[PDB]
Design a protein around this ligand. Sequence first.
Ligand code: S07
Length: 460
Amino acid sequence: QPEPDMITIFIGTWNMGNAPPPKKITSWFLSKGQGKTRDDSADYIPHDIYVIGTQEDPLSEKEWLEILKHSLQEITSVTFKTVAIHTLWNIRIVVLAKPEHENRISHICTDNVKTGIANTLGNKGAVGVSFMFNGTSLGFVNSHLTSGSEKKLRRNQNYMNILRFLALGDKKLSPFNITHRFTHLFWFGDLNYRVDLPTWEAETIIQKIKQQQYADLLSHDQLLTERREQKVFLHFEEEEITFAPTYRFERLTRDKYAYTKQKATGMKYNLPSWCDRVLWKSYPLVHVVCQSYGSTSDIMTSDHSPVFATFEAGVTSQFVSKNGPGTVDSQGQIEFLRCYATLKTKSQTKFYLEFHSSCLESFVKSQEGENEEGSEGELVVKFGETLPKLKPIISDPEYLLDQHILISIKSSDSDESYGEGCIALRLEATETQLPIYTPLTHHGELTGHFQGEIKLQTSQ
Ligand SMILES: Cc1ccc(OCC(=O)N2CCOCC2)c(C)c1
């Protein structure tokens, strides 16, 4: 029975509003309602992996798992296996997979981050899960960020705290945060970004939603505007939104948006907003295609509607050769030519690189580069032709061309990373000098660039 080169992944996010779910929630897992929806002809075809993020979840883990498994079994006639479940306060993540995937899944990690300080510590934060699916690493983050229309900068801070401190994936990738540790990273939840229009425009916004005219609302969505200004979720993707705002509804109908200030809201307005979102980041040139992104219309126990997103995701097999794993394959080599880093830093330490990849036996530390002054007042660190030749464990091009090299540029004085990035080995040619490029980030913000040429030797 062959190993897959593609799987499908369901991502769900639902802020349950502290209420139990209705008896039927199958529309969520079928990607039916508003937006980009799944074709009826696929209804019986199970996804490989289902990842369910809840916020304001009032259920026990047992209660919710029973509902989820019975829902999927009704749809698919498949009894899913529980990969992971992790809850922080009322924020929860569940990972279910087809039973045929049980021996494909390993290295399961869970973690949480609590955001805020004092007043603001005690109900917001994130839960996450990571694991290996054959040769592919998968990470999943469910975050419930700070609420309120005037707190977008707090949400951005919550995002940075979560990606700095959530401890998922391979701990040997010590310079790298979760935005570089996975082949595919999915980040979803009640991100709580609002449509930034005046309170006086509430009824106008409602009108627009009734007309399915979302363009003038999406142009004020705080998450889209913050992402365009590179304030949050740098280098993440989001499918186009074609569904109505998923917050704030009167419960037990979807006919009414409840936006007016009440004692129960702390006398805050809740204009209709896309609070409930799914974003992703995959390594360069890895197949990832969003096949649905929408909201349900028929689950009305909460003041939020559930959101679904589904993806085709490229995966690779657990490769064995006669040589690696357990030795190098001398028919393989990775050379970096004429490389230089450009850094936004004011510092004047010397810098060195670290190369990390599961195609290496262990990470590789370069010599220090040569600092020069850039024309427009930046630091250029030149490595020339000084970089160590990397010795992959397997030379077969069917393996090596699917791999990636993570790069960290570190201070010689402090050994701290000033920037992290990723280079694909999915090249147009082997035995050929070819341009490479990655942006560099640290704590998920832009700190520079790395560019140069690569020359990849495979056994072919
Ligand atoms: C499909 C699959 C499911 C679980 C699993 O390992 C983890 C496990 O067995 N757990 C017990 C129940 O709670 C979560 C942890 C693996 C390797 C594959």
